[PDB]
């Protein structure tokens, strides 16, 4: 298996509305467990999952200080970006940041992340070697040269290979009950007659966890490439997920088309039909 | 725990 600890950070300038909006969100796999919001009534790191509440006061004070330090960096960065691109100080701009680690079963680091985006587009990213940078435009080339001279990647690599991996292991341990749980999908098939003779057969999958799932309408073997339309797996409030797949079948021969779901929450794959 | 910019600005 493979798990991840990742932090998603956004800074949004808002001239005339005060200091930039600053937000940090931490995820274990796809589960939010911590969040910092500069616009909150009391700006500090807050628990978003049950298993993180057991962390002591020094944890929350340290993380809040880290966020406040980061916020100041992003404040300066947003102004620097205006310089680089020769942009007006009157518009809103975004600076996004994602950092984290993908770790496999043993404890090996699959991949480390440390990348930035400006106004929704790639800006600069730490390469897989965790030593060199990839800059996406001329502004980012300046940043790359600055960070190369400063040897900035060394500390970043140290975090990804060390702290990130170590704390992910702790988080997975403390949050084992919910993070590594399995919920099987409840599946059913709907029937809709299009105004043109044919019939739309849709296979639903509800209430499953984790999100990883395989939905496949069948035939007579294992085809059905690109006549089956999908929706991306979408979340629910309770942390579970849903998804559906549909095919267009001629009226009467609906009984030959069969739907199959694959999920780790199931002892064996489900077989459904209309 | 999360990552720090360490004031290494762009």
């Amino acid at each position: 298996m493979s798990h991840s600890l990742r932090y998603f950070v956004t800074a949004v300038s808002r001239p005339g509305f005060g200091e930039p909006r600053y937000m940090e969100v931490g995820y274990v796999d796809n589960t939010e467990f911590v969040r910092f919001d500069s616009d909150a009534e009391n700006p500090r790191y807050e628990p978003r999952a049950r298993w993180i509440e057991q962390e002591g006061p020094e944890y929350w004070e340290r993380e809040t200080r880290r966020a406040k330090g980061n916020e100041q960096s992003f404040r300066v960065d947003l102004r620097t970006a205006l310089r680089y691109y020769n942009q007006s100080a009157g518009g809103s701009h975004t600076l996004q940041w994602m950092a984290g680690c993908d770790v496999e079963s043993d404890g090996r680091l699959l991949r480390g992340y440390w990348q930035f985006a400006y106004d929704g587009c790639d800006y600069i990213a730490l390469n897989e070697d965790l030593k060199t940078w990839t800059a996406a435009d001329m502004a980012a080339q300046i940043t790359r040269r600055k960070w190369e001279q400063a040897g900035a990647a060394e500390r970043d690599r140290a975090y990804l290979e060390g702290e990130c991996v170590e704390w992910l292991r702790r988080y997975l341990k403390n949050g084992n009950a919910t993070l590594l749980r399995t919920d099987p999908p409840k599946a059913h098939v709907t029937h809709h007659r299009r105004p043109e003779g044919d019939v739309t057969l849709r296979c639903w999958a509800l209430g499953f966890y984790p999100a990883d799932i395989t939905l496949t309408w069948q035939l007579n073997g294992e085809e059905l490439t690109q006549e089956m339309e999908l929706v991306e797996t979408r979340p629910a409030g309770d942390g579970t997920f849903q998804k559906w797949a549909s095919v267009v079948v001629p009226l009467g021969k609906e009984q030959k088309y069969t739907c199959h779901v694959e999920h780790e929450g199931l002892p064996e794959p489900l077989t459904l039909r209309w | 725990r999360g990552p720090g910019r360490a004031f290494v600005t762009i």
Partner: antibody, heavy 113, light 111 residues
Framework: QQVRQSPQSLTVWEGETAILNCSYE??????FPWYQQFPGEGPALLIS???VSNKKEDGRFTIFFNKREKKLSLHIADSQPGDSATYFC?????????????WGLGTSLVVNP | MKVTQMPRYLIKRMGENVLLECGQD?????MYWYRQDPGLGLQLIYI???????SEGDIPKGYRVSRKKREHFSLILDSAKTNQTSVYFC??????????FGKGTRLTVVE
């Protein structure tokens, strides 16, 4: 107080390994740069280490680091009279909320011919 | 790739105003003013994170600073005291990475 170097002054003979010690109090310190300052000049970065390492080597200069004891040292191998200078050890919590570096008071090194 | 400091030497009567200027060519956002008494340690006077974004160091008393442009950082003494006789170093860095120091300014305040 937070960063304490010793001794205040060290005198070695050339060819000998000079060892400059430093201890710190804040366990949150994770970045430890050493600066070399020759008389009449400004300090210059000599060598640095991160707290996740136990050793950092660059030519004749080596930093050894002990995180548990909150102690480190700069080792100057095959010391020369030209190495005679004031050496500062500094520290900072890189994930803290300011960009201030906490300085040791320095060790003046004298390498006898 | 260096910090430049002017003037290198300066003599001022007590009570007079003093201006030390500094420049760096590395596009560093963070800059510093230090003073160092002969044979002693580095004392931080002021740190600047950006234009018009300055914070007090350990010993701001008797000093003030000006950061109107990112490339420069001025140290200002409104009324020079004799105990402000020292060597002053301007510095810059990209956050918690290598700090670049100027060659220093030997300021002597005489009666």
């Amino acid at each position: 107080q937070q960063v304490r170097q010793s001794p205040q002054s060290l005198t070695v003979w050339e060819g000998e390994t000079a060892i400059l010690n430093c201890s710190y109090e804040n366990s949150a310190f994770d970045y430890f740069p050493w600066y070399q300052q020759f008389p009449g000049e400004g300090p210059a970065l000599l060598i640095s280490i991160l707290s996740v390492s136990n050793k950092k080597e660059d030519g004749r200069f080596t930093i050894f680091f002990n995180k548990r004891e909150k102690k480190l040292s700069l080792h100057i191998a095959d010391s020369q009279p030209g190495d005679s200078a004031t050496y500062f050890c500094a520290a900072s919590a890189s994930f803290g909320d300011n960009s201030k570096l906490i300085w040791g008071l320095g060790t003046s090194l004298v390498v006898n011919p | 790739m260096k910090v430049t400091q002017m003037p290198r030497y300066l003599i001022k009567r007590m009570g007079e105003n003093v201006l030390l200027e500094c420049g760096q060519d590395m596009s560093h956002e963070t800059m510093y003013w230090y003073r160092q008494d002969p044979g002693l340690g580095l004392q931080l006077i002021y740190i600047s994170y950006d234009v018009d974004s300055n914070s007090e160091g350990d010993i701001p008393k008797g000093y003030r600073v000006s950061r109107k442009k990112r490339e420069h950082f001025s140290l200002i003494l409104d009324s020079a005291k004799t105990n402000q006789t020292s060597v002053y170093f301007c510095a810059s860095s990209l956050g918690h990475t290598e700090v670049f120091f100027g060659k220093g300014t030997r300021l002597t305040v005489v009666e």
